[PDB]
């Protein structure tokens, strides 16, 4: 679950 | 503990 959450956060950070 | 911290960080990132 942490891996999925961190992947989403990393995608969001890369978008910004 | 890392899961709780990362969840908080993800909530903060989603807020911004």
Curated annotation (Swiss-Prot), chains A, B:
Localization per Swiss-Prot or TrEMBL: Cell membrane
Top-level taxon: Eukaryota
The protein's assembly and partners: Homotetramer.
Comment, domains: Contains two Ca(2+)-binding sites that are allosterically coupled. The binding site in the intracellular domain modulates the voltage dependence and the accessibility of Ca(2+) in the transmembrane domain.
Role played: Monovalent cation-selective ion channel activated by intracellular Ca(2+) in a voltage- and temperature-dependent manner. Mediates the transport of Na(+), K(+) and Cs(+) ions equally well. Activated directly by increase in intracellular Ca(2+), but is impermeable to it. The activation mechanism of TRPM5 involves a multistep process.
Family, per entry: Belongs to the transient receptor (TC 1.A.4) family. LTrpC subfamily. TRPM5 sub-subfamily.
This protein's name: Transient receptor potential cation channel subfamily M member 5
